[PDB]
């Protein structure tokens, strides 16, 4: 099923859950999403899609989820290639910069600053030949590809801009695009009402890309239907 999950909030709030996933499905199945922005001179760790203050640091945050066992960081603030040089010699676990770029001349400056893979969704979409630009000149394995999908009208179509457009496109003929295009892995989330369990047994078959599965679990119960 899933290869990976990510984590965020559920991980601040409960270290050892990172600990837990990566004892039981190996550290390699263990992505932290990081979120930071800068409070009074230095990185902070904020929580609730960057709504509130954990009152941690970055430097401290990144060093903790390491030694719980983290396998990656998904690392979010074109680019703040000052916070991720500040992350790059804190950790020696790859470093996913969150995207939001659509040009090459900005996800140069991402891996230049010390990322190992870029996450790119809506522009990808507009421009799938973006894919295959990463893929070329860093690599496949530096392409991260993020889905988000869902039900309409009894097929699990695309959308873009967080999840707010219909692009129209189906789940199926892009998860197969992006592979075409060589993207190295897929990041899937459900905007459908935990794990959209179906979804993740829809694309699985659809590709040999690893697959990373954004959730909002709490618990090590939930976390194990997306493996």
């Given at each position: ?128 030949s973006?894919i295959t ?48 295009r060589g ?45």
């Amino acid at each position: 099923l899933a290869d990976k999950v990510i984590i965020n909030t559920a991980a601040v709030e409960n270290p050892s859950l990172i600990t837990q996933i990566a004892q039981t499905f190996g550290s390699q199945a263990v992505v932290v999403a990081i979120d930071a922005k800068r409070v009074d001179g230095e990185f902070m760790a904020f929580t609730y899609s960057g709504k509130k203050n954990t009152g941690i640091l970055l430097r401290d945050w990144v060093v903790e989820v390491e030694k719980r066992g983290a396998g990656e960081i998904l690392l979010a603030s074109g680019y703040d290639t000052e916070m991720i040089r500040f992350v790059r010699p804190l950790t020696t676990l790859p470093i996913i910069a969150s995207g939001g770029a659509g040009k090459m001349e900005h996800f140069l400056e991402a891996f230049l600053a010390g990322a190992d893979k870029v996450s790119i969704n809506t522009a990808a979409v507009e421009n799938p030949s973006l894919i295959t630009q990463i893929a070329q000149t860093f690599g496949s394995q530096a392409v991260v590809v993020a889905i988000v999908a869902k039900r309409v009208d009894g097929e699990f179509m695309v959308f873009t801009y967080s999840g707010k457009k219909n692009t129209g496109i189906l789940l199926r003929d892009w998860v197969v695009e992006v592979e075409k295009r060589g993207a190295g892995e897929i990041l899937l989330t459900s905007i459908d009402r935990g794990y959209d369990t179906e979804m993740i047994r829809f694309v699985r078959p659809l590709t040999t890309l690893p697959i990373i599965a954004s959730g909002g679990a709490g618990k090590m119960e939930h976390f194990l239907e997306a493996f």
